[PDB]
Subunit: 335 residues, 4 copies
């Protein structure tokens, strides 16, 4: 037999980290980091953090307060001075032919940050690494709202720089919730207003998929699974818990998941194991559902699913006008 | 709190751009750009534009009129003459061993342009970057119509050159609609006729997915969602709006989306929010549907979906002949 | 308006081609081409053709007869002798430290050829480039039949050499059908017998998806779409056409698609447009279906789909024994 | 005709192999192999085996006993000493600036080994090469159980080193079953306990998909396919065979597939061809099903699927309390 020993955690390690440079250098750093060969010189996450600082004045000092270093690790150390240098707080080159950003570069930085912040609000880089056509659609909507619809297609100067590493890095920081809260609650001047309109749409019920799946089930289920006593008792509790959270949080309620608020856990599967099991069961059949703690069984869900409930009757005769409209599409009446 | 400031657009930027060279050089440019190492020297979109110019005589002057530059940016500037050169209007090398295209090179250029133009008509590069087996099938159909079916498999000389960047670039230009209109309405000599036969099939109802999803719903839905009053009133309006557009546009009606005609928006979800909600609901159940502006609810759609409508009865007895045919497959009658 | 001119095919072009070398050199070529750096020196398809020649003695002379060149193009020409060399009929290096194949190299060549030939029989490289877990399962079954099950996992020496280009190239050659026919009808000694057992399973009804989808529909459809007169008349014709082809082709009938036999077209959608429309409609609903030439409509298919047919009744009471078995799983009877 | 000859297996081949180095060098090897440029010097599987040895004290001697070599092949031989060296049993460099692992490096090694061992227990690398969001979720659960939830996002130091080759290699070794058994049955100290909690969840019914699909069918199927006599007779046998295996194997029963126990084959499709056909049929319709040896037909399954069975009635009236709860979601009663 193996002895049952296992690798133990050490204490104390410097690992490579990204940085944000100095506030006065934000624009110069951003311009330099538009070039792939420059990005190759630093921790991969650094340019994304610098672009966010450029996007949102005031954000650099907030990151500093959260413990984000000014210095980025270098891709390769420089044994330059008898001493070995592994990091720096400046990312622009000696050849300092300072120029300003073009319009298309600005839109491209918007595109990169749009994907990045979508990943941060949903708590995952999986869709940005992959599921990206929905993301581009949001970006195109933004660009049209800003009267630059062609840029929805053409602002691709950062297309090879995927933000996935920066999504993961920000998602692991203790201040991620506060950062999202600040984005959702700040009244930004244009074009920030239009940028945040898209992030807010994405953030609504983000990381509250148990809540929204249950609500869908309660609104749309047409079968008797809703009536299974342990399910029904949890429906009442869920609606009451939800109402209390809505009263407490008001307009932030749809954002509890996105801001990593501790109350979001009150609407997790573990809080309503039988109802979550029933709703997940229904939702997979409509498009391993039994939750830890649930006493309801799959065989019971199957049997009750075959029985119908009613949500009221609306009249057994169509109006003359609706009958005529039905004839336009080859429908003769109710059956 | 963040102050609410946001990055502002600048005015005035030269960014890198592709080019089309000179009309007299189209074939020589195209031959040179069949080589990957030559393509690496220029903006990625340039060869696709040059291949289109080769495909369609007259297109080069149309692009010029639309503001497409003759000069392409170079991948790397040349500090050659005390002056720094960033672009050129010629893409063939000094070593000018001019040769003609082979048959297989022509078919390969057809393949590249086929994918490219499919992306342009559908308004997206997502399928070409990925969903490509349907595209190859169209290309194989073309090659068979041109009595070269083996080339459907073998014309792969440009297989590593994906047109996705050129789809996006063309899709962002103000003249994209006019370009598609000109392709759909020009009577091309062979082999252009056969090439355009495939593009026309793809362009039919392209970017009119709300229109076609509603039409599918109106033809195929067998439930009472069609009878919900706010839905039914929009069915009548939709059919009448559609008839008016059909009268106005005649044979171009299926191409309004592909040509980016302003009337296409008259058949967008926003124009029929309740009907679009109902049709999207139905279509996802048959294969977030509530549209901005809709008053219909998911719970109402669910309840009405459970009730059947009729599209007429066709007789309760099979003919003797159809009964006999049914016996051939083990069917005993109607039930 | 564009003038309607289009790029015309030229006549006469040498393009690069793969080769098969000389028969006496098959094994030496194969051993040399197990190394990626050697494969990089030649047309990408060459090693796959050489491995097939190694797999199947006699195949080299058949390829020669089909017009396959002995010489492969080189990745890079050699201006070596005042004359420029673009191709060669030998693929092994000057440093001719001739060795024999290992067992694991043989299994790895089997793996590569297994994927390759699956792509050839199905007429597509799309699954091999991508959909590969089903392929590995076939390969593992082969390796177990040959009493080397570990090689199902470990025979990965050619894992980075995907056969997709060679699938496409062979699929475009005029002799592809004859090649598949010869593979399916030759009685191979072991381990060829076991290799071909897997290819035969894959080849069965390959590229006869219209035939098999219709047969599925006729066996499994429980609705009245089968009774629509234009559909029913084509059901009778289809069964009779199919019976005639079965009589004519006997044990080759399931292989007509795989061998590219002209009779396969007799079972294409165009031959039974209404039945194919009905079967495709059914099959998409069970898992753009209207075929060119069909008169049946989607709205008619929808309406008839809602009516049930019967395939006979089997008794309204369970036997005592089957009732008891039903109690073991919580089933109380028929409903 | 081809003669029917086929390539024959040779006997006797040295192929490249990974290694595990020496026990005293495990940590030094692991630290050196955290660097990609060092990993590039050796067989790709070597670092994964070394990381496993670091993870689990005692595992190195078990691998040695199973025939795992100490020496790894080198990516490139060194003609260094008049003699040619192809392998070595040490993987750390001459420049032996020995350091200890950081916390984040430990978590990153946990991440790599988590994916690796998931692939080993499920018997496939396909999901790890691809289907990875479910894997990250397991890793995040682990990291939270170990009070380091940020590492669920940030422990990415080995993110570019996918374990797929090492999954395949271990999966092909004769001792893979014993290795998994030892992992599942050893009582590991923390953090091994928490690591193995995730592997055990994944290993439960791993590679017993026929067993679990049949059990799902027997619990959830609401149609008369269960009553088809050849199916029903196999239901009884299956439940009895399963009960016997449960008695024999007790808490190991869910792990028979994961440990490659010979009894797992007693629950393969071939053992219950008709029931497996029925369950696979049902399962594809609920989300080529006829098994070798089955006499049941798809047309019979279709017909019986249309008839309902009952699993008992539970009362035709809701309690007053459940009626009130139903009113909260717009449900008026049973229908």
């Amino acid at each position: 037999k193996l002895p049952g020993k296992f690798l133990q955690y050490t204490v104390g390690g410097s690992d490579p980290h990204p940085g944000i440079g100095h506030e006065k250098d934000i624009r110069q750093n951003a311009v330099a980091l538009l070039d792939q060969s420059r990005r190759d010189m630093f921790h991969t996450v650094t340019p994304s953090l610098v672009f966010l600082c450029l996007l949102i004045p005031g954000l650099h000092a907030a990151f500093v307060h959260g413990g984000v270093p000014r210095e980025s690790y270098l891709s390769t150390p420089v044994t330059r001075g008898e001493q070995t240098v592994v990091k720096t707080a400046k990312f622009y080159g000696e050849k300092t032919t300072q120029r300003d950003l073009t319009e298309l570069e600005i839109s491209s930085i918007f595109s990169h940050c749009c994907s990045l912040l979508i990943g941060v609000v949903i708590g995952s880089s999986s869709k940005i690494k992959a599921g990206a056509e929905q993301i581009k659609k949001r970006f195109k909507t933004m660009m049209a709202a800003l009267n630059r619809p062609s840029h929805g297609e053409t602002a691709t100067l950062l297309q090879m720089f995927n933000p996935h590493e920066a999504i993961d890095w920000i998602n692991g920081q203790p201040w991620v919730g506060s950062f999202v809260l600040s984005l959702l609650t700040t009244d930004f001047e244009s074009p920030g207003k239009e940028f945040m309109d898209q992030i807010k749409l994405v953030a609504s019920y983000a990381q509250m998929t148990t809540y929204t799946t249950i609500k869908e089930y309660l609104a749309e289920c047409m079968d008797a699974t809703l009536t299974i006593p342990v399910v029904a008792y949890e429906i009442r509790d869920f609606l009451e818990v939800s109402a209390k959270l809505k009263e407490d949080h008001a307009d932030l309620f749809p954002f509890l998941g996105a801001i990593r608020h501790p109350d979001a856990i009150k609407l997790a599967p573990r809080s309503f194991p039988n109802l979550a099991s029933a709703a997940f069961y229904w939702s997979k059949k409509e498009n391993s559902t039994i939750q830890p703690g649930a006493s309801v069984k799959e065989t019971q869900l199957a049997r009750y699913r075959r029985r119908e409930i009613s949500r009221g009757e609306d009249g057994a005769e169509l109006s003359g006008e609706i009958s005529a409209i039905m004839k336009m599409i080859g429908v003769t009446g109710l059956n």
